[PDB]
Amino acid sequence: SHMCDAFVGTWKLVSSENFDDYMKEVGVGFATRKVAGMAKPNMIISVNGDVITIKSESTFKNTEISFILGQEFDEVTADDRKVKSTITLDGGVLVHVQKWDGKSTTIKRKREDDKLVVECVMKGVTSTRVYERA
């Protein structure tokens, strides 16, 4: 009955490219990058009314955000940055912008064939992470 229906469900990580470089660009330190790079998270996406919830579950750490499209919220990220986030839908793509200390990074999620493709961009550096249904 809505746009976001194509995203809903439980997803598992199947491939990752350039994720160590993207994390260096964001400022993540060595030990966190090593543990993050080894993670094989599940991503669980659900909708209730106007509220969308995205859960990332892994061996080390579970994180979860709930939000309304276009309404800014405060978020603590898995590497413990405190950021201001806004998530919108742009032409069928979920676009998550995070701002902290004069910096910005964007995470886009798109459905492509049977995959949910996550593209993370900071300055010049892009990491692509591909998920399939669990």
Ligand X SMILES: O=C(O)C1=C(C(=O)Nc2sc3c(c2-c2nc(C4CC4)no2)CCCC3)CCOC1
Q: Judge whether 22 is annotated as a binding position.
A: no
Angle between helices 19-26 and 30-38 (to 10 degrees): 150
Q: Give yes or no for a contact between 127 and 19, defined as CB atoms under 8 angstroms apart.
A: yes
Q: Which residues does a gap of C–N over 2.5 Å follow in the chain?
A: none
Q: Count of CB atoms within 10 A of residue 43's CB?
A: 20
Minimum CB distance to ligand X smaller for 85 or for 129? 129
Q: How far is the CB of 61 from ligand X (least distance, A)?
A: 4
Site residues for ligand X per CB under 6 A = 23, 26, 28, 32, 35-36, 39, 41, 43, 56, 58, 60-61, 77-79, 107, 118, 120, 129
Minimum CB distance to ligand X smaller for 71 or for 106? 106
Cα 97 from Cα 110, distance rounded (Å):
15
Q: Judge whether 131 is annotated as a binding position.
A: yes
Q: How far is the CB of 58 from ligand X (least distance, A)?
A: 4
Residue showing the smallest CB distance to ligand X in the complex: 79
Binding residues for a fatty acid, as ranges, are: 129-131
